[PDB]
Structure 1
Amino acid sequence: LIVNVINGPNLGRLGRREPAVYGGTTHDELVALIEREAAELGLKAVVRQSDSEAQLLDWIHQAADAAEPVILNAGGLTHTSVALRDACAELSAPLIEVHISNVHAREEFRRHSYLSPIATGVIVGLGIQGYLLALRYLAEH
């Protein structure tokens, strides 16, 4: 059972700066953490990160075609991209929107998400653990 975990722009640099806002973990540490939690639940997690909106669209496309669930932290494109929203709306399996930081306690523009209205559900502010709680929801649904 495959679960795609997809990270958007700038998330490749997790841990290098403001560990107050996004955690101390780097992206390789995140990938290993998610893979371990996913094996413990009976799932396989494919974890991918890209700064390129076209590349993220490609991965969502493949997820739609294989009818696989998506855990998406779209970074900045969360608030700006209709193209990514429409590609995510093709997913027949669940879609969990994840934000490491509490986007409601930050700038006003971070409060609006193209993704939330079409997601199965949203987890915000729970730090890197939010990804792990999303997998666990997909294990039980």
Structure 2
Amino acid sequence: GSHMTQQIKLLVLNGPNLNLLGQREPEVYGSKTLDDIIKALTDEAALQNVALSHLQSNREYELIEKIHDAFEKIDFIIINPAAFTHTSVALRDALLGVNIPFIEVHLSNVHARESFRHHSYLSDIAQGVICGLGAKGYSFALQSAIGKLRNI
């Protein structure tokens, strides 16, 4: 490593049911696992002097407690809250409480689904939102975080 940049510490958070990625009818719904996505993203981040940490959980409390633990340690969050996007005021208040900028990512286009999925407790306080672009959305959020923090 010969990095001239200040290191960024970035946390990726994944919400409920995303552990199932790649393991129902892979020929129909797609083959990539969450582990595959995060391994590729961690490698992409490391080339740009970004240290990437990750948690996926079906437990709302684990996501809230990981956000609390990020206070004064993490520079940026990428979050795919999955179903909790629509329901969790507690996650909104955790992110407001630690004051870390974040990007919201969804694999699927939330606006093309049921009307209840059009509402997010996070989108109005996110720096931005990516939906419908599949796993590449995490890479775009990483690229955006680097640009937003380094002013590039």
Q: Answer with 1 or 2: which has the greater Rg.
A: 2
Identity %: 48
* Aligned counterparts of 2:89 and 2:98: Cα–Cα separation in 1: 15
| CA RMSD across the alignment | 1.6
Contact kept? 2:9, 2:73, Cα under 8 Å: no
Q: Which has the higher contact order (CA 8 A, sep 6+)?
A: 1
Contact kept? 1:63, 1:70, Cα under 8 Å: no
Aligned residue for 1:115?
A: 122
Match of 1:26 among 22, 27, 33: 33
In the alignment, structure 2 segments of 5+ residues that lack a partner are: 1-7
Aligned residue for 2:57?
A: 50
Structure 1 position 140, deviation (Å): 1.2
Which 4+ residue blocks in structure 1 deviate beyond 6 angstroms? Answer: none
Match of 1:40 among 27, 36, 47: 47
Deviations 1:56-80 (A, max 9, x none): 0001111234243110001100000
Aligned residue for 1:79?
A: 86
Letter in 2 for 1:78: T
TM, length-normalised to structure 1: 0.92
Structure 1 position 18, deviation (Å): 6.3
TM, length-normalised to structure 2: 0.85
Secondary structure at the aligned position of 2:67 is classed as helix
Contact kept? 2:11, 2:54, Cα under 8 Å: yes
Aligned length: 140
Deviations 1:10-38 (A, max 9, x none): 111111126666x4210110110110111
Aligned residue for 1:2?
A: 9
